């Protein structure tokens, strides 16, 4: 009856945007009070607690989401009706919309808030407030959302269930691969280059896996074919005429 039910997408968008607004306000309030000095007790009180709480929470959330999606997976995937498959495709598109919003929040907003925070302060630790919000909050969040989208597609849609989509694998792993690349960021800003320049090669890894976002181009196409074959000839006669 309801092929396009957008309640999940709206809930996810509202939650993510409210959370990031709260994070931005917290950054504004406590960036100067406690984020300037890394050896001060207020740094531990107001910034390290976020890290120590958020890494295990992110890991648990990702593992639980993957496990729940695999547990509640459809067993007779190939016997899905066209209407139910269309609804599943719509839910996957909602997953990808939330993923794109999270990708903007992580890879664009906080990544350049990094450029500005590093230009205002003298770096004294590998965990700055900008680093804490960017590397250890936003990237894992969109990695969790990518895991959710990938496993929903694999467990609900027959096309993605039989085999592994190369575009989906790229778009789910490459943007996640920036998180291990934080090790190269830390190594280059401590031994290789002594200056806070963004065009430094130590950030080329950041660039390379960023290209993996373009993998979404494939995934959308893989959905569109599934949409096309679902509409049929007569429905095509409706849409193209």
């Amino acid at each position: 009856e309801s092929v396009v039910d957008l309640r999940g997408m709206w809930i996810g968008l509202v939650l993510l945007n409210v959370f990031y607004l709260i994070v931005r306000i917290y950054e504004q309030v406590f960036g100067w009070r406690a984020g300037l000095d890394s050896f001060a007790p207020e740094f531990q009180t107001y910034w390290m607690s976020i890290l120590w709480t958020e890494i295990p929470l992110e890991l648990v959330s990702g593992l639980g989401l993957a496990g729940y999606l695999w547990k509640t997976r459809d067993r007779n995937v190939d016997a899905v009706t066209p209407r139910e498959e269309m609804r599943r495709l719509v839910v996957l598109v909602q997953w990808l919309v939330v993923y794109g919003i999270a990708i903007y929040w992580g890879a664009s907003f906080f990544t350049e808030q990094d450029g500005t925070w590093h230009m205002t302060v003298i770096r004294d630790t590998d965990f700055t407030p900008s680093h804490i919000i960017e590397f250890y909050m936003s990237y894992p969040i969109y990695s969790v959302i990518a895991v959710g989208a990938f496993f929903y597609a694999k467990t609900r849609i027959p096309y993605f269930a039989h085999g592994y989509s190369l575009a989906f694998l790229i778009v789910a792993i490459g943007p996640f691969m920036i998180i291990p690349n934080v090790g190269l960021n830390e190594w280059g800003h401590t031994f290789w280059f002594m200056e806070e320049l963004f065009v430094a090669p130590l950030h080329w890894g950041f660039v390379f896996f960023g290209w993996m976002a373009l993998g979404v181009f494939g995934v959308v196409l893989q959905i569109l074919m599934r949409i096309h074959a679902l509409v049929g000839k007569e429905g095509v006669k409706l849409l193209t005429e």
């Binding site: 999940g8 809930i11 939650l15 959370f19 994070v23 107001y46 607690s49 976020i50 709480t53 729940y68």
Partner: peptide, 23 residues
């Protein structure tokens, strides 16, 4: 106030899990 952002991240994960498992 050093436990505000951690508490909001947990509230987000919980509200998501409950509401999305219902839908």
């Amino acid at each position: 106030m050093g436990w505000l952002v951690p508490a909001a991240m947990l509230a987000m994960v919980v509200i998501a899990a409950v509401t999305l498992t219902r839908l």
